[PDB]
Design a protein around this nucleic acid. Structure first.
Lengths: 84, 56, 89, 85, 88, 58
DNA sequence: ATAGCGTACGCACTTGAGTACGTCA
DNA sequence: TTGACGTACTCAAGTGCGTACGCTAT
């Protein structure tokens, strides 16, 4: 857990940007006003996160989670008859 | 959302931290060093995103 | 008790406010409301004119995931919130 | 609508990127390999489209359209009883 | 024949009905061909879903719909859990 | 989120157009000039987007 | 007696932008 | 011939990066 002030984060900004992409751990910025606290995340890690919350907002993840424990059986994708 | 280079972001760094929270927008940092791209988001928005990832 | 605009919500959309409360988003939602009371067209909170433009529906962000969808009556200076929850459940 | 080939789009690429942001009209890229056809849209114009598509994808716009047509009434946001709903 | 055996959950076959009637069958089939050869191939907007320890993955049928699947690396079996990212 | 400068996009312009159709992900063009900020979408995805906004309005 | 801010410096490194060439099918 | 395609040149304009200053708030 790396937490830093906004002023020191500004002075180490280029090195913080390289840090999140090498360690894959976000940097937290905390200043005098807690409502301005921010997080720095690597772009590739952010892609996994955005895709996850998008599939959650559409209700897909709830279906995926329910289908994982529904005990309905599996069918090979070659045995699928598209005409039926 | 906003896409900007780290040099431009550093000139308005304090306003950047307020905008990601007040606008609930991700600000993407993308410069010439394309492998060091990142995103800056508000902490409260990040907490909600964390709770969404681990909700069943 | 007095502001530039009257902010209201469709009663059928009040179901969204219960999900907002239990998600601890009430504070962020009320910040949207205060802006809607003062100026619903203010370029803040990721304000966006939804498509198609002629239907004049607008959107503001509670966070990255949820939005406040609303229309604005400019004659009566009233803001009609039609949605405050952007997840399917 | 402005339509151009990929090769012509590559010659005038920097001028096309400034057209979508000034003319606010998409540029269509159509070439001999139609499977690679694409469209260029200004970023500010795209944000409204992506926001709308997200609200459509989540079923939110279906709720909005259904709520616009019902006769459920209206409550002032200040009169909301947060402790009971 | 192929490196991986691609299966779909029976309760998810109703998604293929909507894939067929939306002209996304060709796009969906190009994904299942990749799943037979390499489900970890960096194509089709392959993404590792969160949380990473559950090892769920997704690929894009189009801008809106995804193929959500898990991989049994031991038995070389890909299990498709969703092929339609809309509630209807 | 795939972000590239206009200069880097023009060096691999043809591969960019193929990738946006095979991966179905928008590609954001952003460089030193805000007048170049644009997004590149596949035509089939763009038509699917246009139909969603238009069909449900009618 | 230090962060919070807007602003600046110097230079190596890259983009921006028009334009071009050679090869291929 | 063509578009498709990879590759190249050029110089003005901008970024990258560490580091700093003057001033206010603390």
């Amino acid at each position: 857990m790396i937490i830093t002030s906004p002023t020191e984060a500004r002075k180490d900004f280029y090195q913080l940007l390289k840090n999140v992409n090498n360690n894959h751990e976000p940097i937290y910025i905390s200043g005098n006003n807690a409502e301005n606290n921010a997080v720095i995340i690597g772009l590739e890690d952010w892609k996994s996160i955005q895709e996850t919350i998008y599939l959650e907002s559409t209700g897909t993840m709830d279906k995926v989670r329910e289908r994982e424990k529904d005990n309905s059986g599996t069918t090979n994708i070659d045995d699928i008859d598209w005409d039926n | 959302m906003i896409i900007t280079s780290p040099t431009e972001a550093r000139k308005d760094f304090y306003q950047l931290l307020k905008n990601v929270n007040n606008n609930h927008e991700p600000i993407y940092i993308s410069g010439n060093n394309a492998e060091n791209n990142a995103v800056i988001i508000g902490l409260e928005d990040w907490k909600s995103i964390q709770e969404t990832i681990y909700l069943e | 008790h007095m502001s530039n605009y009257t902010v209201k919500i469709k009663n059928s959309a009040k179901s969204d406010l219960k999900k907002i409360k239990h998600s601890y988003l009430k504070k962020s939602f009320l910040e949207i409301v205060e802006t809607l009371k003062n100026d619903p067209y203010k370029i803040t909170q990721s304000f966006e004119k939804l498509e198609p433009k002629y239907l004049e529906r607008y959107s503001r962000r509670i966070n990255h995931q949820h939005r406040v969808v609303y229309t604005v009556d400019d004659r009566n200076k009233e803001v009609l919130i039609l949605s405050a929850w952007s997840h399917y459940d």
